[PDB]
């Protein structure tokens, strides 16, 4: 509640607000019979002890205490009554006038000495001439004092400190010391040692800090509070709340100057200002919507293709292929159709693992039965010429392929287990990449193992390439080996190109570009494989 | 260097060191002349007001200047006859008294007022009477009374200032004294009075550079002569802990005002005892012959390879073929290098060789034995129908080449992946305890070695099934009967050893690990290369 006190107390003191926020106005003032006479400073206390008023004030009250100790001598001195002789008058006029030069910050002083008032008053600093005009103890203080007269004038605020002089029934007299405070400032308007101790910060901190984490509204002096004295080297900094990426952020938006407001601004996704274009990369729908619809359509068509094959058996053309083998190939491809749909969402960890788990099993089920079928053809040919036909339809090929499936399962299990152990230390999965324009995007990193899988598929397919080379004169009824040759070479070339491209230009590619390339490669290899191995089964009879 | 000068200054003043070692001294014995006019003051010459020893002296000098300002005001009083009446004489000495009770600590004071001495002085604080005798605030060194003995005072200063006169120099001063007995005597660091910043016998000149963060002070750096009193700052003596390194707390020897040693409690770890906790005990009765014996096994295996190189006839071995038995007798060497490697410190290069050797050795030995056992079965199942497709080296070897390719590939992948996280964490050379707070250096488990443990188990399952198949085939030299043992042994012992090694990972000593490795290696491998070889030179 300390903050609002100043605002509500401004309307009991006309013309004064302009003086605090503009000290120099006094020059043009000819109104206000008497200026401010008493201002409420009790929120921190009656008066700040050990204040931040510099040692100056401490040493001033110390000189006053020494002086009063001096006057606390002749109250009891023997025969020290006299009759106010001229020498005694000189001593009296000197004893406090000396106090002036001992502190650069003491205004006029005086001594009452009621017996003949005999009071003396002095002029300003560095030029002072005495003038004579005809219960409680321990240095009681007082509120700031204003010379009423018929204005306020430049001097403005001075504190009227005083104490008492006891005698041998007190003396009904005191000593007056005045302290100039124009040269001192407020306690940075946020500390706890003066008028505005951790208060008078209208619409800052509590209003701008809780939400704005690390708002830092002060820096060196928050919420310039009253001024009026001067503008010293404390550097009173207003609207200093930066907040970094905080929801309030800089907030250099509106309600500037004394009427501070507009705490909430310049915070969208990253530590920037004035909207959300920075950092986040542009997202399009024309290259992120039709793609998935097309992929789903192709998937559904493949499903219906599997079914129709289930509906055709007696066509001897397929009989050579074998129902089980072709169904396995189609399912392998269907499974291979999930590196794009997975890329359509945010790159989590579960998805970033699902991607490899799908790609590897597909790339092993599809071109792990074509190669074996070519092998079976080659072996049967090389054996028939010498009294032998060992191989047979599904039942041998599938069992042999089970070995490749076992090896792939094993490697994937090892890789998954190893990856979900380092999560305690580092993730190294969901990284951020730049694109030469100070924009960050979230992607999945390279594991240094994918380099190995890329070359593993290449080496494996070399075996199929050699098979293709060997079988070139075998009489075939439906030219199936001729077709599968394309399905092998095409992959050997494309997959290599796509892998190298994806690896080199890895971080320099936005998410949408990655999706485009993935879809391109998938529909340039897998679709060709399905089409080549299937279409020539319902035609060319 | 001021330390050395202070030590020299110690021996130029009789019966004086004991005052700083012990405050009283005169309390038991004070028999000396006017001694202690000046000892060191301050290493940087003097302190006008710098080094800030308590604010009490700040306020003292401030009151001094303030009071002298009064007199400076009473310099050119107009028509000041100053006849020195009873009231005139009263005023000045009343002021002199007044200057007293404004501060806690202060001693006698006096005013000369040379017009006729007119010198007025009083006693210490809280006890003042009147005694008459018959620029820029210059300082002075510590003072002591000289009329007889030394007694209590103990280095009270004699600050004073003068006053000016006009119509020249009045030749008058306002003397004050300050008792410094009740004052903290510096901290022997962070240069102040009587002590510039190191100021003791080898605070760090012998120990700290060896071990940084010595922490000699904590709150009071290597408490110095002191002597004025014992303040509440807890003068810290020999407080330099320094944790590890030779510079330590060093609670060993030479513990006194001269404790220059501070040289101990440094053996391998941040402890004080002799090296023993940091490094577990090593034996030689166990860690020495274990390598000599394995060297002998290796040399015998090499000579046995040669011996087979010198026997090609004796058809008994023809059924196995030179090209294959040689491969086995070589794969064995590779398998024989998990012990010699473990004989040295666990670096990273060695901690990688440990897998590179083991995996290749295995894939060779039980990648050729299994294939031979498969060839026998195939030939048997084929001859019963007109067919003999298989053949010795040239057929088995290329089939084994596939296993070697796969193993090479996996090892390359694993090595590359493990020499990439070294930028962040090493996760290779770790340490563990054994329930008695003992640390030792070992190689940890990669979470991939679990997979390699089960891979060989699955592989040898194929071998055991082969063994189950070939049971009634007529064999000339019972070779399959032999190889069955070589397969089951490594099915069982290998699994047991792997589980034991993995579960008791960190709770096992280094020498204990060496013992277990040697036991396992010589309980399976030797049986393999002795069972497949010995019969070839007997049972003819």
């Amino acid at each position, epitope marked *: 509640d300390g903050t609002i006190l100043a605002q509500k107390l401004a309307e009991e003191v006309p013309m004064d607000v302009a003086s605090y926020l503009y000290t120099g106005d006094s020059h043009q003032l000819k109104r206000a019979n008497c200026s401010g006479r008493y201002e409420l400073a009790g929120l921190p206390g009656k008066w700040p002890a050990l204040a931040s008023a510099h040692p100056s004030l401490h040493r001033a009250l110390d000189t006053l205490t020494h002086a009063t100790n001096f006057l606390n001598v002749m109250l009891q001195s023997n025969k020290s009554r006299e009759q106010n002789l001229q020498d005694d008058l000189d001593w009296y006029q000197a004893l406090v006038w000396s106090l002036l030069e001992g502190e650069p910050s003491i205004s006029r002083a005086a001594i009452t000495f009621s017996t003949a008032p005999q009071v003396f008053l002095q002029a300003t600093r*560095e030029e002072s001439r005495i003038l004579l005009q005809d219960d409680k103890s321990h240095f009681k203080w007082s509120p700031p004092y204003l010379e009423c007269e018929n204005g306020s004038y430049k001097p403005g605020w001075l504190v009227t400190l005083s104490s008492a002089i006891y005698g041998l029934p007190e003396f009904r007299g005191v000593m007056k010391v005045d302290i100039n405070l124009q040269k001192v400032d407020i306690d940075q308007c946020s500390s706890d040692g003066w008028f505005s101790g951790t208060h008078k910060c209208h619409l800052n901190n509590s209003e701008c800090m809780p939400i704005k984490g690390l708002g830092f509204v002060l820096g060196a002096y928050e919420c310039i509070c009253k001024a009026g004295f001067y503008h010293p080297g404390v550097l009173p900094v207003n609207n200093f709340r930066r907040r970094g990426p905080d929801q309030h952020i800089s907030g250099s938006t509106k309600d500037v100057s004394e009427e501070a407001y507009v705490c909430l601004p310049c915070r969208e996704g990253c530590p920037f200002c004035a909207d959300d274009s920075p950092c986040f990369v542009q997202e399009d729908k024309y290259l992120r919507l039709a793609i998935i619809s097309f992929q789903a359509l192709c998937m559904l068509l493949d499903f219906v293709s599997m079914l129709v094959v289930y509906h055709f058996r007696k066509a001897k053309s397929i009989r050579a292929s074998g129902l089980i083998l072709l169904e396995t190939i189609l399912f392998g491809s269907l499974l291979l159709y999930f590196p794009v749909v997975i890329l359509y969402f945010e790159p989590s960890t579960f998805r970033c693992i699902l991607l490899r788990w799908a790609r590897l099993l597909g790339f092993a089920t599809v071109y792990g039965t074509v190669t074996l079928k070519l092998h079976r053809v080659l072996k049967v040919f090389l054996s028939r010429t010498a009294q032998r036909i060992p191989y047979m339809t599904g039942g041998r090929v599938m069992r042999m392929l089970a070995v490749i499936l076992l090896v792939v399962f094993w490697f994937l299990i090892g890789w998954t287990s190893s990856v979900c152990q380092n999560l305690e230390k580092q993730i190294s999965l969901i990284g951020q990449g730049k694109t030469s324009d100070h924009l960050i995007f979230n992607m999945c990193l390279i594991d240094r193992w994918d380099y190995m899988t890329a070359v593993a598929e290449f080496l494996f397919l070399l075996w199929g390439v050699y098979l293709c080379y060997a079988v070139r004169t075998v009489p075939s009824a439906f030219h199936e080996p001729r077709y599968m040759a394309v399905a092998v070479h095409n992959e050997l070339i494309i997959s290599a190109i796509f892998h190298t491209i994806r690896f080199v230009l890895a971080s320099r590619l936005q998410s949408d570009w990655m999706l485009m390339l993935y879809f391109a490669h998938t529909h340039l290899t897998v679709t060709v494989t399905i089409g080549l191995l299937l279409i020539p089964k319902f035609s060319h009879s | 260097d001021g330390t050395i000068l202070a030590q020299k200054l110690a021996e130029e003043v009789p019966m004086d060191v004991a005052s700083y070692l012990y405050t009283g001294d005169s309390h038991q014995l004070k028999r000396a002349n006017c001694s202690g006019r000046y000892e060191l003051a301050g290493l940087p010459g003097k302190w006008p007001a710098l080094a800030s020893a308590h604010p009490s002296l700040h306020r003292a000098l401030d009151t001094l200047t303030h009071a002298t300002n009064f007199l400076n005001v009473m310099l*050119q009083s107009n028509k000041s006859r100053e006849q020195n009446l009873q009231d005139d004489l009263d005023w000045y000495q009343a002021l002199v008294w007044s200057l007293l009770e404004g501060e806690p600590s202060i001693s006698r004071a006096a005013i000369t007022f040379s017009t006729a001495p007119q010198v007025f002085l009083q006693a210490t604080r809280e006890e003042s009477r009147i005694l008459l005798q018959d620029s820029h605030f210059k300082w002075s060194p510590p003072y002591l009374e000289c009329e007889n003995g030394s007694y209590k005072p103990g280095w009270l200063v004699t600050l004073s200032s003068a006053i000016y006169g006009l119509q020249p120099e009045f030749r008058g001063v306002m003397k004050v004294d300050i008792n410094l007995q009740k004052v903290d005597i510096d901290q022997c660091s962070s240069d102040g009075w009587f002590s510039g910043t190191h100021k003791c016998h080898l605070n760090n000149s012998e120990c700290m550079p060896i071990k940084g963060l010595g922490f000699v002070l904590g709150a009071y750096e290597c408490i110095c002569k002191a002597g004025f009193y014992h303040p509440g700052v807890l003068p810290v003596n020999n407080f330099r802990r320094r944790g590890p390194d030779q510079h330590i707390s060093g609670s060993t020897k030479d513990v006194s005002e001269e404790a220059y040693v501070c040289l101990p409690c440094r053996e391998g770890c941040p402890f004080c005892a002799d090296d023993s906790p940091c490094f577990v005990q090593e034996d030689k009765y166990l860690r020495l012959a274990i390598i000599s014996f394995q060297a002998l096994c290796m040399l015998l295996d090499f000579v046995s390879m040669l011996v087979v190189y010198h026997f090609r006839k004796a058809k008994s071995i023809r059924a196995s073929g030179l090209i294959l038995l040689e491969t086995i007798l070589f794969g064995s060497l590779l398998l024989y290098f998990p012990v010699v490697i473990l004989y040295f410190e666990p670096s990273t290069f060695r901690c990688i060789l440990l897998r590179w050797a083991r995996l290749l050795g295995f894939a060779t030995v039980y990648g050729t034995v299994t294939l031979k056992l498969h060839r026998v079965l195939k030939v048997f199942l084929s001859r019963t129908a007109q067919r003999i497709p298989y053949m010795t080296g040239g057929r088995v070897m290329r089939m084994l080449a596939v296993i070697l390719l796969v193993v090479f590939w996996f090892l390359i992948g694993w090595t590359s992946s493990v020499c990439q996280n070294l930028e962040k964490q090493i996760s290779l050379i770790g340490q563990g305890k054994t329930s008695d707070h003992l640390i030792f250096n070992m190689c940890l488990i990669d979470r991939w070695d679990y997979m390699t443990a089960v891979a060989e188990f699955l592989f040898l399952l194929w071998g055991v099934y082969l063994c189950y198949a070939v049971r009634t085939v007529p064999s000339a030299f019972h070779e399959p009967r032999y190889m069955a043992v070589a397969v089951h042994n490594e099915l069982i012992i290998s699994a047991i050893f792997h589980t034991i090694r993995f579960v008791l990972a960190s709770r096992l000593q280094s020498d204990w690990m060496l013992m277990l490795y040697f036991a396992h290696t010589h309980l399976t491998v030797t049986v393999t290369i002795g069972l497949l070889l010995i019969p070839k030179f007997s049972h003819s």
Partner: nanobody, 121 residues
Framework: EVQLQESGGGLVQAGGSLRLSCAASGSIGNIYIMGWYRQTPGPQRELVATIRTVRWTKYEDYADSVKGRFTISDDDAKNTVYLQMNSLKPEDTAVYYC????????????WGQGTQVTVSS
């Protein structure tokens, strides 16, 4: 270091008067001392006057010989420091020099202007 402004021109006889105020424009009032160095070093009828004692309870600095001579005073917050030429004498002819004496003034002070006066019998 104050530019003292002397204004004392005018032809006066014996027994006349004149207010030659060395105003301290660059400073404030009764803080310094005077003593009015003059070109003629041989005044047989006593010397120029001076007043004030810097800051301590302004005192009449006549040397017991100038009391019945040029008289000087101030008005507290009055920088104008005039010296009325009481009982003027023929020797008055000279160039007067108000000066500084407060501090950093070992060999007295210095002047910043010269007034050429002429007095006859």
């Amino acid at each position: 270091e104050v530019q003292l402004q002397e204004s004392g021109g005018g032809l006066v006889q014996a027994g006349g008067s004149l207010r030659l105020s060395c105003a301290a424009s660059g400073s404030i009032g009764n803080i310094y001392i005077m003593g009015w160095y003059r070109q003629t070093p041989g005044p047989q009828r006593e010397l120029v006057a001076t007043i004030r004692t810097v800051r301590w309870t302004k005192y009449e600095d006549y040397a017991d010989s100038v009391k019945g001579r040029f008289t000087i005073s101030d008005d507290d917050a009055k920088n104008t420091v005039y010296l009325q030429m009481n009982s003027l004498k023929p020797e008055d002819t000279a160039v007067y020099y108000c000066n500084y004496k407060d501090y950093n003034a070992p060999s007295d002070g210095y002047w910043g202007q010269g007034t050429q006066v002429t007095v006859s019998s």
